[PDB]
Amino acid sequence: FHTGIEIKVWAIACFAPQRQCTEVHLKSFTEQLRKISRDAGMPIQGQPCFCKYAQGADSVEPMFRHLKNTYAGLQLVVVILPGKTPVYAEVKRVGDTVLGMATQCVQMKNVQRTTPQTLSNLCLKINVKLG
């Protein structure tokens, strides 16, 4: 576990349908993630700079290019996925290989229904990536 991470600039890209994963689900998930990440000493600080819905792997690269060009110092994009989807492989291709932007994927189900254990799982994955 890496100490000293501070996530100041971060975004949400929700590829799950808004009807399943609504804005108030995203906001409640955000506040719970902020609380546990701060308590664990890897604070995800502030609201996300960007939080939008998209659909389809074909929307990943245009969205991620916009994010990279628009938010200097963006440190992480949290990517919400509707279960098993080609969006995952495209997010990793665009983020890790095309553009060089850290992404952390999370299942829609764990945003719809947050629990401490799944938030913890997510923080540990983010810690590996950013530490």
User: Where do contacts with ligand U occur on this chain (CB under 6 A)?
Assistant: 81, 83-85, 88, 103-105, 107, 125
With both helix axes pointing from N to C terminus, report the angle between 116-130 and 23-39 in degrees, rounded to the nearest 10: 70
Residue 27, contacted partner among ligand U, its own copies, none, CB below 5-8 A by kind: its own copies
Measured from the CB atom, the residue of 20 and 85 that comes closer to ligand U is 85
Burial group, residue 13, by CB count within 10 angstroms (0-12, 13-18, 19+): buried
Establish if 73 lies at the interface with its own copies (CB under 8 A). no
Tokens of 46: 């502030």
Beta partners for residue 79, in sequence order? 13, 105
Query: Which position among 92, 99, 107, 130 is part of the footprint of its own copies (CB under 8 A)?
Result: 92
Q: What angle do CA 16, 17, 22 make, to 5 degrees?
A: 95
Residue 27 lies near its own copies (rule: CB under 8 A):
yes
Is 41 near its own copies (CB under 8 A)? yes
Tokens of 69: 């060009």
128: number of Cβ within 10 Å: 11
Query: What's the closest the beta carbon of residue 12 comes to its own copies, in angstroms?
Result: 13
* Interacting partner of 1 out of its own copies, ligand U, none (Cβ under 5 to 8 A depending on kind): its own copies
Choose one: 8-16, 29-37, 70-78; the region binding its own copies (CB under 8 A). 29-37
